[PDB]
Coordinates of C-alpha atoms in Angstrom, one line a residue:
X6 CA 0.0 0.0 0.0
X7 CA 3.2 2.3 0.4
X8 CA 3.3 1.6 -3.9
X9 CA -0.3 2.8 -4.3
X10 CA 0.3 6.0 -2.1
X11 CA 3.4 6.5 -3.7
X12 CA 1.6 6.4 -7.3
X13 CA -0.9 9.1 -6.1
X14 CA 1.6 11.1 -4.9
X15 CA 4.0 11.6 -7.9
X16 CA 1.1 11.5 -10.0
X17 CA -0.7 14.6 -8.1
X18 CA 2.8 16.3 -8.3
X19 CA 3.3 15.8 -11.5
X20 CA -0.2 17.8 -12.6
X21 CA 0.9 20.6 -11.4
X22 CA 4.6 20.9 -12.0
X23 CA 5.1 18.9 -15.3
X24 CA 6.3 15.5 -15.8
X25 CA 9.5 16.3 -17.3
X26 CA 10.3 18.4 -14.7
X27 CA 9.9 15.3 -12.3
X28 CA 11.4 12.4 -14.3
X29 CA 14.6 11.3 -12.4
X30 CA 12.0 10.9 -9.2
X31 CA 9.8 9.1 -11.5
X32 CA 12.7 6.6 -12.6
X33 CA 13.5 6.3 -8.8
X34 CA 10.0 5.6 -7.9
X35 CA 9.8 3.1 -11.0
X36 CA 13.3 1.2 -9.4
X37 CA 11.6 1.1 -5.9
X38 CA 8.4 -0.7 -6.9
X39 CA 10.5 -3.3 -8.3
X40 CA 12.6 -3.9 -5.8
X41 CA 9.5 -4.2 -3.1
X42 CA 8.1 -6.3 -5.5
X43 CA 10.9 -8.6 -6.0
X44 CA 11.4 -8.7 -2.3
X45 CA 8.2 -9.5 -1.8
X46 CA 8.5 -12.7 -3.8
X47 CA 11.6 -13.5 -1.8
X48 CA 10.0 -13.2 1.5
X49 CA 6.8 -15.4 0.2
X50 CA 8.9 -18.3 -0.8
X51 CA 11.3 -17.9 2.0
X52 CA 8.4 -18.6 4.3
X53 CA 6.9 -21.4 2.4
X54 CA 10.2 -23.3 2.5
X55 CA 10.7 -22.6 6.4
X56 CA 7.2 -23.6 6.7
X57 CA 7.7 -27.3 5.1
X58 CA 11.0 -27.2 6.8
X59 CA 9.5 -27.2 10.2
X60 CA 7.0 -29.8 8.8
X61 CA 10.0 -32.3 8.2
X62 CA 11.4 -31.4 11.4
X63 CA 8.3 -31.9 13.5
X64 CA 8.0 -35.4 11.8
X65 CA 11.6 -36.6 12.3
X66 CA 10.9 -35.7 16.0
X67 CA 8.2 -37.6 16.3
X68 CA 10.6 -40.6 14.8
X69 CA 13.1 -39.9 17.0
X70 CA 11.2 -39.8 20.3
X71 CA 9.4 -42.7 19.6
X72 CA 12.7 -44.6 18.9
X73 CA 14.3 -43.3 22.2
X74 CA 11.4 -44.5 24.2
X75 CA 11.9 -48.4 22.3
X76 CA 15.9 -47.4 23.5
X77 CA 14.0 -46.8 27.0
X78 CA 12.4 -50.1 27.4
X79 CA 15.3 -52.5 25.9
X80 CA 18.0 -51.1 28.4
X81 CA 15.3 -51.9 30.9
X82 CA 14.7 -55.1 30.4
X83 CA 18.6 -55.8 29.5
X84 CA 19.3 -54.5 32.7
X85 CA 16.4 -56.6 34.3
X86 CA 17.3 -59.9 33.1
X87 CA 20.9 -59.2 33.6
X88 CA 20.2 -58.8 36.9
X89 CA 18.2 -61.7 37.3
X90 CA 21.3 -63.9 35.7
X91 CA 23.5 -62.5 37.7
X92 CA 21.7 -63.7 40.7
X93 CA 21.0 -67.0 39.5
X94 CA 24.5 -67.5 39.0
X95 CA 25.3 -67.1 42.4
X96 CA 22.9 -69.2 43.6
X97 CA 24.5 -71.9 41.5
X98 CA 27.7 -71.3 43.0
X99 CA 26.6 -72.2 46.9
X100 CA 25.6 -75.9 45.9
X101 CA 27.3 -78.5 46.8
X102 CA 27.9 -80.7 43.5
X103 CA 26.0 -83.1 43.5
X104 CA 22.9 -81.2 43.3
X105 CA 19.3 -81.6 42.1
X106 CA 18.4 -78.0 42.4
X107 CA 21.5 -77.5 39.4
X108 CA 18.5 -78.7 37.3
X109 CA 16.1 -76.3 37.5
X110 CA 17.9 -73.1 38.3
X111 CA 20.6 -74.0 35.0
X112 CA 17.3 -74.1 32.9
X113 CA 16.1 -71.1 34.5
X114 CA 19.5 -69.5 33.5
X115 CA 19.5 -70.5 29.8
X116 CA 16.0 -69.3 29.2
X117 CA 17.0 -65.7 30.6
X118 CA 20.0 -65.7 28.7
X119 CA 18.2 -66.5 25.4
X120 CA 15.8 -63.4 26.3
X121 CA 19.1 -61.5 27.0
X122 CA 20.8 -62.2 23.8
X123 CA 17.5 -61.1 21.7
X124 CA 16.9 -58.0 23.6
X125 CA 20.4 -57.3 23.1
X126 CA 20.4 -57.7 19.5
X127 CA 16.9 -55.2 19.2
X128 CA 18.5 -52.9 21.3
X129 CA 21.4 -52.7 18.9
X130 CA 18.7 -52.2 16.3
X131 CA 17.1 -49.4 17.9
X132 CA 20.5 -47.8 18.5
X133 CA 21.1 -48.0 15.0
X134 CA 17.6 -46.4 13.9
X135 CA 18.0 -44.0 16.3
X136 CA 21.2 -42.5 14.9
X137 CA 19.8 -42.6 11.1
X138 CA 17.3 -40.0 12.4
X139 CA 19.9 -37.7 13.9
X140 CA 21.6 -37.6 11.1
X141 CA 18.6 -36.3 9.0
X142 CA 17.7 -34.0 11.8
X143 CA 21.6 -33.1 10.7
X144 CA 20.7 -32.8 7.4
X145 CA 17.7 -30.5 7.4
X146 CA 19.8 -27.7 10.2
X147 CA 21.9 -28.3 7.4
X148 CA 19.6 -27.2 4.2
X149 CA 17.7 -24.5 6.8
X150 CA 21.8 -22.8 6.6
X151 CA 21.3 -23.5 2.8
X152 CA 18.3 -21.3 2.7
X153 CA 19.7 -18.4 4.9
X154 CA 22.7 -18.3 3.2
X155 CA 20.4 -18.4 -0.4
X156 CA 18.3 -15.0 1.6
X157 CA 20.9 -13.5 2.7
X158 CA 23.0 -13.7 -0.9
X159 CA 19.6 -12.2 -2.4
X160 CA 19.0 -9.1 -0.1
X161 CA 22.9 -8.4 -0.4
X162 CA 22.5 -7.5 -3.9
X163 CA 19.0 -7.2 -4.8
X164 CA 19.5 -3.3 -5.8
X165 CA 22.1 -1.8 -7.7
X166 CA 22.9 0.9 -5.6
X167 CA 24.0 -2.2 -3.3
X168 CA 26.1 -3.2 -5.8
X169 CA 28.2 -0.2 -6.1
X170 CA 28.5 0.9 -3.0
X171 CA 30.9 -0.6 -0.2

């Protein structure tokens, strides 16, 4: 709305003091409407990209903390059956040898350590999954610089009086 007052403006001045008279201003107000305008443009698709930006970043967060909470429940459950191993074991080493009780508390001990082994092997899964998605977290702080360095570049020499000035 600056443009549209600006067009009354040098158009009321020009009726009454003659439009040769006023063309340099003319030429500058000519030069200033493009600029806005191609500023404008800049600023519309700047925001659109930030806007999908966030997007992607909202949606590899959601990835990510789902993955953490999976990380969350394997060390758990490592941690639980570890213990319960480790406490086997030492039952197993107050027996005298020739034991019946070996029998059932050995079993015991293998079918935890089977559970142990698994959970340890997801764990390493989630791990892994969980480090893919920080990485493209990476990536996208990475094309957001991209994107202010592509602004920045624009509104650094978007006029030529930018140009040939220091």
């Amino acid at each position: 709305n600056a443009s549209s007052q600006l067009t009354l403006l040098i158009g009321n001045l020009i009726q009454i003091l003659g439009e040769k008279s006023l063309t340099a201003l003319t030429n500058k107000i000519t030069a200033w409407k493009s600029q806005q305008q191609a500023r404008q443009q800049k600023n519309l698709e700047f925001s659109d990209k930030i806007n999908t930006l966030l997007s992607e970043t909202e949606g590899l967060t959601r990835d990510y903390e789902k993955q953490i909470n999976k990380l969350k429940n394997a060390d758990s459950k490592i941690k639980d059956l570890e213990n319960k191993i480790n406490q086997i074991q030492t039952r197993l080493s107050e027996l005298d040898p020739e034991s019946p009780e070996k029998k059932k508390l050995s079993r015991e001990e293998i079918q935890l350590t089977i559970k142990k082994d698994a959970a340890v092997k997801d764990r390493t899964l989630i791990e892994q999954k969980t480090l893919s998605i920080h990485s493209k977290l990476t990536d996208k702080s990475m094309q957001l610089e991209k994107e202010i360095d592509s602004f920045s570049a624009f509104s650094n020499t978007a006029s030529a009086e930018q140009l040939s000035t220091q």
